[PDB]
Design a protein around this ligand. Structure first.
Ligand SMILES: Nc1ncnc2c1ncn2[C@@H]1O[C@H](COP(=O)(O)OP(=O)(O)NP(=O)(O)O)[C@@H](O)[C@H]1O
Length: 279
């Protein structure tokens, strides 16, 4: 699929840098015709047929296709796409309140504050999974707040760089996100499905409640070994006054066998809730 090839600077003015990844730099921008602000994600294209630098056209088109399908309060949306010889430029919904990662760094959360965030994450993931979209890179950096200065911030899931449509219940292409957050099936290069996101949600929940990471070792390989072995525990120092239902929720997500793990629908009915890899 080919995108708009006009100069993005003819239609937008760019401002501050919002962040960067391994694929992209993201800048605040303002559309000239409307005065509305967006996040322009510049993704560097591959320069050759066999290069490791940049992102393949297949991968860029997948992220764009997935983003084009999305419309939900807890996910970012895609406004426009441009391209030139060097970059594809995705004009994304702006999330101006910073990462959940930054917010957590500033202040461990009460169970209420943690569930406030978590219910919104679950709603966003319920939407994605209903569409058979596995995000495959859920972690606190990829949850962003609309406004960080309110007592109950609204959030949006970002970073669809690893997202895939799951047509047959599993896909096999070795996707591999961030070691602290990946499920055992990712570590073991097994077929992957929507269940991998549910494991990541378990890890996120553990961190929200404690400020500690359940599998983190001193090296990436050690983290990955810990993940595969389900080598975590609830340290009393962090969890002694945390509710047993909260621990139950996490326990039912941090399950090696993806078939035995809670689904997104299960997680919403749970009594606690219910109303790249190499060094
Ligand atoms: N819609 C947005 N609004 C505000 N900031 C954003 C937005 N999208 C991305 N960012 C920031 O830009 C950073 C990089 O974007 P991201 O989509 O993660 O790029 P990537 O290089 O494709 N993937 P990764 O390597 O996993 O970071 C993020 O970590 C955020 O800090």
């Amino acid at each position: 699929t080919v995108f708009r090839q006009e100069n993005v600077d003819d239609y937008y003015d760019t401002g501050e840098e919002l962040g960067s990844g391994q694929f992209a730099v993201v800048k605040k921008c303002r559309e000239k015709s409307t005065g509305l602000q967006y996040a322009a994600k510049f993704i560097k294209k591959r320069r050759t047929k066999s290069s490791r630098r940049g992102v393949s056209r297949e991968d860029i088109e997948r992220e764009v296709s997935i983003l084009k399908e999305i419309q939900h309060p807890n996910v970012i949306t895609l406004h426009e796409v441009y391209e030139n010889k060097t970059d594809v430029i995705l004009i994304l919904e702006l999330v101006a309140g910073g990462e959940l990662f930054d917010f957590l760094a500033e202040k461990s959360l009460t169970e209420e504050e943690a569930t406030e965030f978590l219910k919104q994450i679950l709603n966003g993931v319920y939407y994605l999974h209903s569409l058979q979209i596995a995000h495959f890179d859920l972690k606190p950096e990829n949850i962003m707040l609309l406004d960080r200065n309110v007592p109950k911030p609204r959030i949006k899931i970002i970073d669809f760089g690893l997202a895939h449509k799951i047509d047959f219940g599993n896909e096999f292409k070795n996707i591999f996100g961030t070691p602290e957050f990946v499920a055992p099936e990712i570590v073991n290069y097994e077929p992957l499905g929507l269940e991998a996101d549910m494991w990541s949600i378990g890890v996120i929940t553990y961190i929200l409640l404690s400020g500690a990471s359940p599998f983190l070792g001193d090296t990436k390989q050690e983290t990955l070994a810990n993940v595969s072995a389900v080598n975590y525990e609830f340290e009393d120092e962090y969890f002694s006054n945390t509710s047993a239902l909260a621990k139950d929720f996490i326990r039912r997500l941090l399950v090696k066998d993806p078939k035995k793990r809670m689904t997104i629908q299960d997680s919403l009915q749970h009594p606690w809730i219910k109303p790249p890899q190499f060094e």
